[PDB]
């Protein structure tokens, strides 16, 4: 009667329903059928039904236990059949879902499991539009869960069935209400519910209640926990969590158990001073991250989540906006573990500069959106990293006006979880900005026209006109191809096929200086940590890509901007990085070299001869001007001070040719 | 009158001719228009005409000079127009070509350069078939070359115009005939041709001749060079080259100059003992490499060539087969520089297990193939790394029988260059094997059916029946996806959608042991160093990919086999690598762990407790058997001996579940 969790990812048989013959090919999960077409820039990539079928041997000894199929994510509608009989449907591409199959299987034989996944367009399931790909299929894990007939229920919106509600938290004491779903299919009886909080081998809490469970009972039980002088989850400084074991016992035997983290903290956002974690001001040095990657689409493996977090911590990221939808439980686990303050959001996404709408005013759309919000909150309730619930991105009032509906979602979020503030990401003026507790804007001053300086004007004017708003920046960024390089700085056309890397570097340096000076801005999030898929894009070095990443789509190459942020945000790892190394061909008679470093100064050498030292500025940048190259090959080297220095080096070619002038 | 070489890669205007309207988009070279479609597995990817146009300002001061447009590579037919007037055509996707434009331009104004590139199917330009993509477009650099009216000619098959023919080479002395093409468009006159051999600042040779040049003269001049006690290019041990400057002088002024490397060596292949470089036996530890990469197709940048060579040297590669076509001058330069013995080949490729033919018996096909061979030899003549000329890959006699034609190519190769042997890569029995000086076979014993043991039987039986043959292995390999992992070793279906990484590891370990024991095998080349594009493939973890690489297509991930070879071929870099780390889920009650290391033994730890030391075998492999894991997470660590060890580590999950049995 130990709970079992059996992965069912291997060897499914797949075909599209547009293939009428019935032949199938082997696939293995996680899987999307849009990893080739959408990623090649095909705008009308396959959106429709793909069918996955697998034989599952139901063990004779599972008779008398309860059996559940839990899906971590299927985009975007899933219809599940056991022995070809429909058992249920889930509508929504990003939340987990579960079906009990206990009474639906034949014990001691192979049973068919068939999943018919549909990512076809709909007007009743958010997201309706967006600058990303709606990759179809079973792109997260599938599990067979086996439990006692009397269990901690897995059936409440596919959540772990335990909510560790933080009611009061300070360094003196924490009070928590452990709410636990119980489900009984055995005879009427009683059981003992135990909640055990530990830190390593040390017991911190232990609470018990006897509970009466009628046959067919599905009930919520609540146990208070008190922890004196708690160790708090304090972001990257100390991402500490207790372990909580919730178990059911009968006549001296444990019959079921689940574990969840408890990371205690408290926070607030001040309109003038920014974000405070556990009573201390904390600048939120944030980036955004989509759940896709080159070649595999959104069919991410655990090492992919692991590498994305490793790259963010290397850069000194301490905040993340996991846009534009609920992401993997494992990704939120890694945010908990590494101390990253997380903004998690539902996929209520508007059109941006494109056509159509994020909101369609019909009951089916509205009720589904509420179910997606409840899923997000209940499924991910216990992650201390999550400190904001995001309710939308770039909705607009024209046509169907989502204002009243967004007020409904806000009230529902506050009722489900009074312990986190709501937030949203806006690109509009007006009423949509005054609903959520924190507000943020997506700003591209210096990329989509204008100069970075208009970001400063916007922030200052907004803060002065509306002093009660807690203002953030939910997106800012600029495109870059690592293969587009030029000696001189000039602003490219955003929508064109030329995105020189130096303009992205310049964009981030100027925008960051504006942000750094404005502590009323509670958090800022770079769009985006990685290049990502968007099939309709036709810009930069190839179609189908949003190239605003600080790192490329395959996670292989860090663009110059990554190191500018690393020098400024990760000050305890010594480093020096020469900018513009991918610009190998130089034409300008007067060369400028620039390095990012954590050192107070650096020295430049050209062809083995020192050009002398320069001091790092407040933004960890060292600059040498009017450097003279010799025609042909030149070796450029920068070094930090001391007898054991760090170095960076490049060979460039200097050419006096051109073109008219 | 210094020679100028001006890169013309930036900002061309592109459209397909199937787009009849005339609108264009900016592109930048190197460029292929098949980097999205063919790489997504679209079998009928775009094969036809793409048009590139750029305005080129012709400087008034270039009047009186000579002007050439040189193309490093356009796949596969290029028609070039200046001010919309046709100037010439090149047929062949892999060799350089050049057109003089001196008398075709208007000086002091912008002139249009239009290139109409066509990669449409043809039956008169090899390669006609092949297991790779025929990526279309201007995928290598374009240059404007500016010279004196009297110059070292760039017009001999677009070669540098100098052939440093090695006539006798030993450690006592080297005799070289410097053959130099001269071209005069100025008045009848004389000039002084100088050939200067140097090592750093030291002069080793200096020879001069006066030459008489008629107006319109295009002539070949030959100067003998003698070098006493030469330093020889000796592979990776000492890849030494002299620098040669060839210059033309008049009345005390230098008027033109080119430089080429001189890497002196001699070699032979013995049917029983293998390959000898500079009189010393040298096992050729080889891999093959295609000129493509994820995302960019064959539009490779110099850092791509640089990274490919870096990865090969890391693995201890000392030989390379640059299949299946002439590759970049820069790639052969890197082979020279790093000491890698190189097999360079023309694209005379047969069908393998697929339909159609590599040979069509018509004069147009045959004459074009001879021009592609002459291009390869003349353009790449001076690279010491190149030690074999490959004439075909997998032709077959059935239908049009290429035997007589391959004898013609062999005789032409020997006439153009008596200093290198010819070779070929075969998958057939019979006469095709008895034409080139060295012969090699493509073998997949243990992958395309059978067991690796049949490679041993083939090699031994062939060597015994035909003792005069110099036998090599031109391809051997097996597919692997880094995302297909399983606890147990079982042979997969080659053509299926399941290519577990452990089978590739096993394949290479067994095949390498067969090779290592057989010194009569002069060279072996892994197919392939990298996964590569082949649009028609439908196997492994995604369509459109040949996944036989030791490294993935984006060059990011080294598969386990890479480290098996690194431990065995690069013995002077200490290392330890735990195999099967990507296999995170373990089911077998009895676990086996395996490490590759350069150390004589290694120690295993499980959950922090030593399982004891094991000795490395002759193949640098350490193995522990019957290792007991605890249910759930286990930390596995291996370390080399000593107080400062090298380590490798992984966390795996051990699960006692399954499926019937
Ligand atoms: Cl909207
Ligand atoms: Cl053939």
Short mmCIF file of N, CA and C in Angstrom, two decimals, chain A residues 93-199:
data_model
loop_
_atom_site.label_atom_id
_atom_site.label_comp_id
_atom_site.label_asym_id
_atom_site.label_seq_id
_atom_site.Cartn_x
_atom_site.Cartn_y
_atom_site.Cartn_z
N UNK A 93 -4.30 23.62 -22.60
CA UNK A 93 -3.06 23.00 -23.04
C UNK A 93 -1.93 22.94 -22.05
N UNK A 94 -2.13 23.50 -20.85
CA UNK A 94 -1.00 23.79 -19.95
C UNK A 94 -1.15 23.32 -18.50
N UNK A 95 -2.37 22.93 -18.12
CA UNK A 95 -2.60 22.44 -16.78
C UNK A 95 -2.63 20.92 -16.77
N UNK A 96 -2.30 20.33 -15.63
CA UNK A 96 -2.39 18.86 -15.52
C UNK A 96 -3.85 18.44 -15.45
N UNK A 97 -4.13 17.15 -15.68
CA UNK A 97 -5.49 16.64 -15.50
C UNK A 97 -5.39 15.14 -15.22
N UNK A 98 -6.46 14.57 -14.68
CA UNK A 98 -6.41 13.18 -14.19
C UNK A 98 -7.78 12.52 -14.34
N UNK A 99 -7.78 11.20 -14.54
CA UNK A 99 -9.02 10.44 -14.60
C UNK A 99 -8.79 9.19 -13.78
N UNK A 100 -9.74 8.85 -12.91
CA UNK A 100 -9.61 7.57 -12.20
C UNK A 100 -10.08 6.46 -13.14
N UNK A 101 -9.32 5.36 -13.24
CA UNK A 101 -9.67 4.29 -14.16
C UNK A 101 -9.93 2.97 -13.43
N UNK A 102 -9.88 3.02 -12.10
CA UNK A 102 -10.17 1.87 -11.22
C UNK A 102 -11.28 0.92 -11.73
N UNK A 103 -12.44 1.47 -12.05
CA UNK A 103 -13.59 0.66 -12.43
C UNK A 103 -13.78 0.51 -13.94
N UNK A 104 -12.76 0.92 -14.70
CA UNK A 104 -12.89 1.00 -16.15
C UNK A 104 -11.97 0.02 -16.85
N UNK A 105 -11.20 -0.75 -16.09
CA UNK A 105 -10.20 -1.62 -16.71
C UNK A 105 -10.51 -3.08 -16.44
N UNK A 106 -9.93 -3.97 -17.25
CA UNK A 106 -9.99 -5.40 -17.00
C UNK A 106 -8.69 -5.83 -16.33
N UNK A 107 -8.79 -6.32 -15.10
CA UNK A 107 -7.59 -6.69 -14.35
C UNK A 107 -6.98 -7.97 -14.89
N UNK A 108 -5.66 -8.01 -14.95
CA UNK A 108 -4.94 -9.18 -15.43
C UNK A 108 -4.91 -9.31 -16.95
N UNK A 109 -5.17 -8.22 -17.66
CA UNK A 109 -4.98 -8.25 -19.11
C UNK A 109 -4.53 -6.91 -19.62
N UNK A 110 -4.16 -6.87 -20.89
CA UNK A 110 -3.78 -5.62 -21.54
C UNK A 110 -5.03 -4.83 -21.86
N UNK A 111 -5.01 -3.55 -21.53
CA UNK A 111 -6.09 -2.64 -21.79
C UNK A 111 -5.55 -1.54 -22.72
N UNK A 112 -6.35 -1.09 -23.68
CA UNK A 112 -5.89 -0.02 -24.55
C UNK A 112 -6.07 1.35 -23.89
N UNK A 113 -5.04 2.19 -23.96
CA UNK A 113 -5.26 3.57 -23.59
C UNK A 113 -5.10 4.35 -24.88
N UNK A 114 -6.11 5.15 -25.24
CA UNK A 114 -6.06 5.97 -26.46
C UNK A 114 -6.26 7.42 -26.06
N UNK A 115 -5.35 8.29 -26.49
CA UNK A 115 -5.48 9.72 -26.25
C UNK A 115 -5.61 10.42 -27.61
N UNK A 116 -6.70 11.17 -27.81
CA UNK A 116 -6.90 11.91 -29.05
C UNK A 116 -6.71 13.36 -28.70
N UNK A 117 -5.56 13.90 -29.10
CA UNK A 117 -5.16 15.23 -28.70
C UNK A 117 -5.48 16.16 -29.86
N UNK A 118 -5.96 17.36 -29.58
CA UNK A 118 -6.35 18.24 -30.66
C UNK A 118 -5.77 19.62 -30.36
N UNK A 119 -4.92 20.17 -31.25
CA UNK A 119 -4.47 21.54 -31.06
C UNK A 119 -5.08 22.46 -32.14
N UNK A 120 -6.20 22.01 -32.71
CA UNK A 120 -6.90 22.81 -33.75
C UNK A 120 -7.32 24.11 -33.11
N UNK A 121 -7.48 25.16 -33.91
CA UNK A 121 -7.98 26.43 -33.42
C UNK A 121 -9.35 26.31 -32.73
N UNK A 122 -9.58 27.14 -31.71
CA UNK A 122 -10.86 27.18 -30.96
C UNK A 122 -11.03 28.63 -30.57
N UNK A 123 -12.26 29.08 -30.40
CA UNK A 123 -12.52 30.38 -29.81
C UNK A 123 -13.03 30.26 -28.37
N UNK A 124 -12.90 29.08 -27.76
CA UNK A 124 -13.38 28.94 -26.39
C UNK A 124 -12.32 28.40 -25.42
N UNK A 125 -11.06 28.38 -25.87
CA UNK A 125 -9.94 27.96 -25.01
C UNK A 125 -8.75 28.88 -25.19
N UNK A 126 -8.50 29.75 -24.21
CA UNK A 126 -7.27 30.57 -24.19
C UNK A 126 -6.05 29.63 -24.19
N UNK A 127 -4.92 30.04 -24.83
CA UNK A 127 -4.72 31.31 -25.54
C UNK A 127 -5.32 31.27 -26.96
N UNK A 128 -5.98 32.34 -27.37
CA UNK A 128 -6.60 32.41 -28.69
C UNK A 128 -5.64 32.90 -29.77
N UNK A 129 -4.69 33.72 -29.34
CA UNK A 129 -3.63 34.27 -30.18
C UNK A 129 -2.33 34.31 -29.37
N UNK A 130 -1.24 34.71 -30.01
CA UNK A 130 -0.01 34.92 -29.27
C UNK A 130 1.18 34.82 -30.19
N UNK A 131 2.28 35.44 -29.78
CA UNK A 131 3.51 35.44 -30.55
C UNK A 131 4.37 34.23 -30.17
N UNK A 132 3.79 33.05 -30.28
CA UNK A 132 4.47 31.78 -29.95
C UNK A 132 3.70 30.67 -30.64
N UNK A 133 4.23 29.45 -30.61
CA UNK A 133 3.63 28.33 -31.33
C UNK A 133 2.76 27.51 -30.42
N UNK A 134 1.65 27.04 -30.96
CA UNK A 134 0.70 26.26 -30.18
C UNK A 134 0.98 24.81 -30.51
N UNK A 135 2.15 24.34 -30.04
CA UNK A 135 2.62 23.00 -30.38
C UNK A 135 1.68 21.94 -29.88
N UNK A 136 1.26 21.01 -30.74
CA UNK A 136 0.21 20.07 -30.34
C UNK A 136 0.78 18.77 -29.82
N UNK A 137 0.07 18.14 -28.88
CA UNK A 137 0.36 16.74 -28.57
C UNK A 137 0.61 16.52 -27.09
N UNK A 138 1.05 15.31 -26.75
CA UNK A 138 1.30 14.94 -25.34
C UNK A 138 2.75 15.32 -25.04
N UNK A 139 2.95 16.59 -24.72
CA UNK A 139 4.30 17.14 -24.67
C UNK A 139 4.90 17.17 -23.27
N UNK A 140 4.16 16.63 -22.30
CA UNK A 140 4.69 16.41 -20.95
C UNK A 140 4.41 14.95 -20.57
N UNK A 141 4.89 14.53 -19.40
CA UNK A 141 4.76 13.13 -18.97
C UNK A 141 3.32 12.66 -18.76
N UNK A 142 3.15 11.33 -18.82
CA UNK A 142 1.92 10.67 -18.48
C UNK A 142 2.33 9.65 -17.41
N UNK A 143 1.51 9.55 -16.35
CA UNK A 143 1.75 8.65 -15.21
C UNK A 143 0.55 7.80 -14.91
N UNK A 144 0.81 6.57 -14.49
CA UNK A 144 -0.23 5.77 -13.84
C UNK A 144 0.02 5.85 -12.34
N UNK A 145 -0.93 6.40 -11.60
CA UNK A 145 -0.80 6.53 -10.16
C UNK A 145 -1.62 5.41 -9.50
N UNK A 146 -1.02 4.71 -8.54
CA UNK A 146 -1.71 3.62 -7.83
C UNK A 146 -1.76 3.93 -6.32
N UNK A 147 -2.96 3.94 -5.74
CA UNK A 147 -3.13 4.27 -4.32
C UNK A 147 -4.02 3.28 -3.59
N UNK A 148 -4.05 3.41 -2.26
CA UNK A 148 -4.99 2.70 -1.42
C UNK A 148 -6.40 3.14 -1.81
N UNK A 149 -7.39 2.30 -1.54
CA UNK A 149 -8.78 2.72 -1.66
C UNK A 149 -9.12 3.94 -0.82
N UNK A 150 -8.39 4.16 0.26
CA UNK A 150 -8.56 5.36 1.08
C UNK A 150 -7.30 6.16 0.93
N UNK A 151 -7.40 7.34 0.35
CA UNK A 151 -6.17 8.02 -0.01
C UNK A 151 -6.25 9.53 0.13
N UNK A 152 -5.08 10.17 0.08
CA UNK A 152 -5.01 11.62 -0.03
C UNK A 152 -5.33 11.90 -1.51
N UNK A 153 -6.44 12.57 -1.76
CA UNK A 153 -7.03 12.55 -3.09
C UNK A 153 -6.18 13.25 -4.16
N UNK A 154 -5.92 12.55 -5.29
CA UNK A 154 -5.30 13.18 -6.45
C UNK A 154 -6.31 13.88 -7.41
N UNK A 155 -7.57 13.97 -6.99
CA UNK A 155 -8.65 14.33 -7.89
C UNK A 155 -9.10 15.79 -7.85
N UNK A 156 -8.44 16.62 -7.06
CA UNK A 156 -8.85 18.03 -6.97
C UNK A 156 -8.08 18.84 -8.00
N UNK A 157 -8.61 18.99 -9.21
CA UNK A 157 -7.89 19.67 -10.30
C UNK A 157 -6.50 19.10 -10.49
N UNK A 158 -6.38 17.78 -10.37
CA UNK A 158 -5.10 17.09 -10.55
C UNK A 158 -3.98 17.65 -9.68
N UNK A 159 -4.32 18.23 -8.53
CA UNK A 159 -3.28 18.78 -7.65
C UNK A 159 -2.76 17.66 -6.74
N UNK A 160 -1.67 17.93 -6.01
CA UNK A 160 -1.19 16.94 -5.04
C UNK A 160 -2.22 16.65 -3.94
N UNK A 161 -3.23 17.52 -3.79
CA UNK A 161 -4.30 17.27 -2.83
C UNK A 161 -4.00 17.83 -1.45
N UNK A 162 -2.94 18.63 -1.34
CA UNK A 162 -2.57 19.25 -0.07
C UNK A 162 -2.22 20.71 -0.36
N UNK A 163 -2.80 21.62 0.42
CA UNK A 163 -2.52 23.05 0.31
C UNK A 163 -1.97 23.51 1.65
N UNK A 164 -0.72 23.96 1.65
CA UNK A 164 -0.07 24.41 2.89
C UNK A 164 -0.23 25.92 2.93
N UNK A 165 -1.34 26.34 3.51
CA UNK A 165 -1.72 27.73 3.41
C UNK A 165 -0.95 28.52 4.46
N UNK A 166 -0.15 29.48 4.02
CA UNK A 166 0.63 30.29 4.95
C UNK A 166 -0.22 31.45 5.50
N UNK A 167 -0.60 31.37 6.77
CA UNK A 167 -1.54 32.36 7.32
C UNK A 167 -0.85 33.55 7.98
N UNK A 168 0.21 33.27 8.73
CA UNK A 168 1.06 34.31 9.30
C UNK A 168 2.49 33.86 9.22
N UNK A 169 3.38 34.71 8.75
CA UNK A 169 4.77 34.34 8.68
C UNK A 169 5.63 35.51 9.14
N UNK A 170 6.46 35.27 10.15
CA UNK A 170 7.51 36.23 10.52
C UNK A 170 8.71 35.45 11.05
N UNK A 171 9.83 36.14 11.29
CA UNK A 171 10.97 35.44 11.89
C UNK A 171 10.68 34.88 13.31
N UNK A 172 9.65 35.37 13.99
CA UNK A 172 9.29 34.85 15.32
C UNK A 172 8.47 33.54 15.29
N UNK A 173 7.57 33.44 14.32
CA UNK A 173 6.73 32.26 14.18
C UNK A 173 5.93 32.26 12.87
N UNK A 174 5.58 31.06 12.44
CA UNK A 174 4.76 30.85 11.26
C UNK A 174 3.57 29.99 11.65
N UNK A 175 2.39 30.40 11.20
CA UNK A 175 1.19 29.55 11.34
C UNK A 175 0.75 29.14 9.94
N UNK A 176 0.53 27.86 9.77
CA UNK A 176 0.15 27.28 8.48
C UNK A 176 -1.08 26.41 8.70
N UNK A 177 -2.02 26.48 7.76
CA UNK A 177 -3.17 25.59 7.76
C UNK A 177 -2.95 24.54 6.66
N UNK A 178 -2.70 23.29 7.05
CA UNK A 178 -2.56 22.23 6.07
C UNK A 178 -3.95 21.74 5.70
N UNK A 179 -4.39 22.06 4.48
CA UNK A 179 -5.68 21.58 3.99
C UNK A 179 -5.43 20.35 3.12
N UNK A 180 -6.13 19.26 3.44
CA UNK A 180 -5.83 17.98 2.84
C UNK A 180 -7.11 17.37 2.28
N UNK A 181 -7.10 17.02 0.99
CA UNK A 181 -8.24 16.30 0.38
C UNK A 181 -8.16 14.83 0.67
N UNK A 182 -9.25 14.26 1.19
CA UNK A 182 -9.28 12.83 1.46
C UNK A 182 -10.38 12.20 0.63
N UNK A 183 -10.14 10.98 0.15
CA UNK A 183 -11.11 10.33 -0.70
C UNK A 183 -11.19 8.87 -0.26
N UNK A 184 -12.40 8.40 0.01
CA UNK A 184 -12.57 7.01 0.44
C UNK A 184 -13.45 6.18 -0.47
N UNK A 185 -12.94 5.04 -0.91
CA UNK A 185 -13.77 4.10 -1.67
C UNK A 185 -13.94 2.78 -0.92
N UNK A 186 -13.22 2.62 0.18
CA UNK A 186 -13.44 1.45 1.01
C UNK A 186 -14.69 1.64 1.89
N UNK A 187 -14.99 0.64 2.71
CA UNK A 187 -16.12 0.74 3.65
C UNK A 187 -16.01 1.97 4.58
N UNK A 188 -17.16 2.43 5.08
CA UNK A 188 -17.20 3.45 6.14
C UNK A 188 -16.16 3.10 7.21
N UNK A 189 -15.39 4.10 7.65
CA UNK A 189 -14.42 3.86 8.70
C UNK A 189 -13.74 5.13 9.15
N UNK A 190 -12.79 4.98 10.05
CA UNK A 190 -12.03 6.11 10.51
C UNK A 190 -10.57 5.88 10.12
N UNK A 191 -9.80 6.96 10.10
CA UNK A 191 -8.37 6.85 9.82
C UNK A 191 -7.69 7.98 10.53
N UNK A 192 -6.37 7.87 10.66
CA UNK A 192 -5.61 8.94 11.27
C UNK A 192 -4.81 9.70 10.19
N UNK A 193 -5.06 11.00 10.11
CA UNK A 193 -4.33 11.87 9.21
C UNK A 193 -3.17 12.47 10.01
N UNK A 194 -1.95 12.32 9.49
CA UNK A 194 -0.78 12.90 10.14
C UNK A 194 -0.05 13.87 9.21
N UNK A 195 0.32 15.03 9.73
CA UNK A 195 1.15 15.97 8.99
C UNK A 195 2.48 16.16 9.72
N UNK A 196 3.57 15.85 9.03
CA UNK A 196 4.88 15.82 9.65
C UNK A 196 5.80 16.79 8.91
N UNK A 197 6.26 17.82 9.60
CA UNK A 197 7.21 18.78 9.03
C UNK A 197 8.62 18.46 9.55
N UNK A 198 9.57 18.38 8.63
CA UNK A 198 10.93 18.05 8.98
C UNK A 198 11.92 19.00 8.34
N UNK A 199 13.09 19.08 8.94
CA UNK A 199 14.25 19.69 8.31
C UNK A 199 15.40 18.69 8.36
#
